[PDB]
């Protein structure tokens, strides 16, 4: 070949830039709903006459 390996005048290219990071884990979750309220007491029956 006409221009041998000593005549190659182009500087070499850089190495590959590093690979990106992975994604994050799945986020947690919003705390579920506390169970419903306890119904109040009940009116004691009619007093006597």
Partner 1 sequence: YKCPYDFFADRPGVRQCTACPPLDLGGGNLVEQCTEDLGSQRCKPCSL
Ligand X SMILES: *[C@H]1O[C@H](CO)[C@H](O)[C@H](O)[C@H]1O
Ligand Y SMILES: OC[C@@H]1O[C@@H](O)[C@H](O)[C@H]1O
CA 36/CA 41 separation, integer angstroms: 16
Site string for ligand Y, 8-27 (x = CB under 6 A): -------xx-----------
Q: Is 4 in the site for partner 1 (CB under 8 A)?
A: yes
Q: What CA–CA distance (Å, rounded) separates 25 from 22?
A: 9
Eight-state DSSP code of residue 3? S
Task: List contacts with ligand Y (CB under 6 A).
Answer: 15-16
Query: Which residue numbers belong to the known binding site for alpha-D-galactose?
Result: 10, 12, 15, 17-19, 25, 27, 29-30, 32, 36-38, 40-42, 45, 47
């Amino acid at each position: 070949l006409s221009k041998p390996k000593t005549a190659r005048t182009e500087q070499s290219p850089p190495p590959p830039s590093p690979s990106p990071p992975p994604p994050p884990p799945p986020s947690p979750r919003p705390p579920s709903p506390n169970p419903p309220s306890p119904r109040p007491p009940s009116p004691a029956p009619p007093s006597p006459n």
